[PDB]
């Protein structure tokens, strides 16, 4: 949890870098901004790589993406 | 639970989770209304406090701001605000299939140049509004320590959200004033490069005027006739070089 631990401690958050600053002159390994250079290799959600989910709903549990695809793996089957 | 969900469902088949279901469902039927209230008050408090901090910080750095954004030095010889120019580079357009449009450079006039009286400083672009709100009316209250601490952490979330929202507004305003100044300096550059028509003003003036009940000494009328705009006869363009 302690990001700049075992040093002087947290200086401040450089939002140009999106990084914390340790009290000695070394970069932390945590972040403070959501505009940060972070590797993203796993995602949630449905209708990805499509138009997204439709805001309208079906009477049944069928879910239809915005580009016309229908995802059974998000939908409920019988 | 439902993660290793064969084991999860066989574990939820046990009766201790079933008797713990009774206490958690009655809580889950209603409790979410406090979260919206906590988020609302956290947003209010964080937005107000961060606004006060940034206004104080902006006031602290007054002199170099007027040093860098000298609108007063930028005006033309007839007290004329320069127009606003935008330049876009290497534009591809895909209007549809089977038809592509390509250009390398293009220029747009956004605000037509006009008259002015005073140089517009930075305070109408960057100064943030502040009020002091002294009315927290929280109708919902916690009862025990659990709702107390989730109230605290949701207020923390609203506090951080308000701070982020204020910073977003600041970024939008500073981008706005930067692009307006960029348009002005681009106009100066292109008029130097002889790519646009300079603004042109005619004037007439009459001597004394009026009847024996009202007079002015000398009456000067100044009217601008030629708005600055780009030329299309590009073969008369003057190039540049450096050293």
């Amino acid at each position: 949890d302690g990001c700049c631990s075992k040093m002087g401690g947290i200086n401040y958050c450089d939002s140009s870098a999106g990084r914390l600053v340790c009290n000695n002159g070394f970069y932390s390994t945590c972040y403070c901004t959501r505009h940060a250079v972070m590797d993203l290799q796993f995602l949630m959600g449905c209708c990805l790589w499509h138009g997204g989910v439709y805001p309208q709903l079906n009477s049944s549990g069928l879910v239809v993406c915005n580009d016309g695809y229908v995802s059974e793996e998000c939908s409920l089957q019988k | 639970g439902d993660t290793g969900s064969l084991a999860g469902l066989q574990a939820m088949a046990d009766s201790k989770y079933t008797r713990a279901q009774k206490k958690q469902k009655m809580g889950k039927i209603r409790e979410m209304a406090l979260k919206e209230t906590a988020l609302s008050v956290g947003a209010q408090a964080g937005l107000a406090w961060r606004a006060k901090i940034i206004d104080e910080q902006l006031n602290k750095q007054a002199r170099n701001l007027d040093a860098i954004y000298d609108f007063n030095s930028l005006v033309l010889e007839h007290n004329i605000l320069p127009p606003v120019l935008l330049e876009g580079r290497n534009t591809l357009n895909l209007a549809d299939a089977q038809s592509i449009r390509i250009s390398d450079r293009t220029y747009k006039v956004a605000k037509q140049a006009h008259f002015i009286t005073t140089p517009p400083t930075w305070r109408q672009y960057l100064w943030m509004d502040y009020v002091k709100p002294e009315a927290p009316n929280v109708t919902l209250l916690p009862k025990t320590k659990a709702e107390k601490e989730i109230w605290c952490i949701y207020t923390e979330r609203g506090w951080k959200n308000g701070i982020d929202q204020a910073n977003t507004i600041l970024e939008e305003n500073i981008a706005r004033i930067k692009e307006d100044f960029g348009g002005m300096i681009l106009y100066r550059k292109l008029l130097a490069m002889n790519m646009v028509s300079p603004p042109y003003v005619s004037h007439t003036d009459l001597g004394v005027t009026g009847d024996g009940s009202e007079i002015h000494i000398d009456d000067r009328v100044l009217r601008i006739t030629a708005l600055p705009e780009l030329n299309v006869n590009s073969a008369e363009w003057r190039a540049a070089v450096a050293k």
Partner: protein
Amino acid sequence: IIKTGDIMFAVLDTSVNSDEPGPILATIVTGKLKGSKLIGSFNLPSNADKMVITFNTMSIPGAEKTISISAYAIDPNTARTALASRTNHHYLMRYGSLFASSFLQGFGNAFQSANTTSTLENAVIGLATVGKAWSQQAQQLFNTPTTVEVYSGTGLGILFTQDVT
């Protein structure tokens, strides 16, 4: 098309006594209707054995429409008609009040009667005259029935009565 007299399930979460009819709710949780719900009331019984739910207004979301199927309730996994609650609420209070007032009346009159063959006379006094008014009040209020109450967390099964489209 929802078939006539089929079986579904919902959850009743509104606890209400069998004393005042009013709007009560359930929401259909499984089957074809998910997100659909059903409001209505209850009915009072003649005796102390059951309670049935007057459910008449069914709603399915999405469009500004409301169907009008009215149907009643069945016991989840027991296939009965009663309510799982207490019924022994108000027998013992009225019985004890009646017996106490009667015993008091008798104590005063007979222990005044057997005086031929201070505080004992005061006992005669007290039971004598507080027996009678309490006894006629007990005869006034004895007829109150023992009620039933649905619970705040009891799910239920549903039989159908008519169809919609």
